[PDB]
Ligand SMILES: O=c1ccn([C@@H]2O[C@H](COP(=O)(O)OP(=O)(O)OP(=O)(O)O)[C@@H](O)[C@H]2O)c(=O)[nH]1
């Protein structure tokens with residue numbers, strides 16, 4: 001991913017975009033009952049905390065495009081992966097504007113809370129002003145489509161979330177590249193059925209975990225994995241992606257019956273962006289707020305891992321590559337051990353910064369004891385070991401609970417944390433409930449007891 005140019009939006013007929021300069025995050029009722037070292041990410045260039053140019057820091061994620069074409073390995077990876085997906089019978093039909101808007105089996109309705117992007121975010125129009133769950137009115141959308149078309153600029157927003165102290169001082173705030181509602185609707189129409197197929201088939205055949213339910217899914221994973229596990233995390237995956245990777249992606253779409261709309265993928269690749277008063281163009285890089293981002297990111301990852309394997313271990317049997325990805329996050333396995341550090345090396349030649357899974361200092365052996373996927377661990381239940389607990393560290397949970405965006409969602413927010421936490425064991429969960437109930441707000445919430453959660457879990461399978 002690399003920025004080709006950037007200049008004043010007025011210089012090209014575009015309005016300056018307004019983005020709140022104030023975080024919605026504020027200390028919560030539990031701010032002092034729990035330990036935490038994260039603060040609301042920098043949202044503006046002014047933020048007193050800064051220690052380097054904001055503007056520069058945020059965009060540095062666009063490290064450049066390391067590769068130019070789709071080499072032999074990438075092509076073989078394309079063939080093999082496209083091969084597996086072929087065994088899914090993925091319906092190649094377009095998705096009717098209705099289902100694409102209010103959802104259907106295997107796909108949720110568009111999210112009404114998130115932006116609507118240009119031009120609507122500059123005309124003042126909002127999402128609830130275009131559709132409604134009970135009506136399922138295509139007409140209003142339809143008109144806007146005919147009126148403004150597709151391929152509309154991406155409105156870039158700085159993401160309002162918690163970040164480490166360093167990532168604050170280095171203005172390393174993450175960006176949300178929101179795509180116009182039109183575009184999103186189009187893409188959901190073109191790739192609607194693909195999305196469903198994936199959401200409904202998390203596993204090693206899609207090599208995707210998107211739309212999965214950790215409480216149930218963690219138990220199917222080990223069965224799917226091969227003997228030896230390997231993993232690593234990417235540094236700025238999305239932005240590092242070169243145009244070649246998008247092509248490989250189209251080659252895959254093409255082979256599975258979507259050669260039809262591979263055009264849409266071009267839009268994610270060669271991007272048109274609006275950030276404040278400035279406008280820029282990006283060659284490569286996956287936009288963060290786009291319909292399919294998650295899935296396409298995962299499909300590309302299936303291609304990447306296959307590529308570095310064919311390139312490094314000639315003769316390797318991909319049919320025994322068992323991997324599951326979720327965007328940049330991946331968990332893989334092979335009958336034989338492989339050198340992650342070595343694969344990481346080939347990664348650079350392909351423009352990817354891969355590192356020891358979980359900020360390790362070095363690439364060590366990956367085991368069921370130390371492997372994590374989605375920040376979660378795998379831990380067999382003491383009473384019925386054949387059931388696996390997805391275990392999120394408490395530190396993460398402690399961090400999230402010390403803050404709040406909307407006081408009216410404290411019930412839902414804490415409840416959620418509880419659904420993650422209890423897997424850390426009953427003793428641990430109770431200490432958590434205890435502290436929560438050590439202040440008025442907590443004591444007022446409706447939280448599930450350990451035994452309630454654990455039983456409900458046992459029956460869920
Ligand atoms: O809205 C956004 C923006 C960014 N991202 C994601 O954030 C990633 C980069 O933004 P991060 O701040 O998470 O950096 P990092 O995780 O790569 O840092 P390290 O672990 O390597 O030290 C990208 O690779 C993309 O997956 C989102 O998921 N959503």
Ligand SMILES: [Mn+2]
Nearest residue numbers: 233234235236
């Ligand atoms: Mn990462």
Ligand SMILES: [Mn+2]
Nearest residue numbers: 233234328329
């Ligand atoms: Mn990740």
Ligand code: NA
Nearest residue numbers: 271282284285
């Ligand atoms: Na881009």
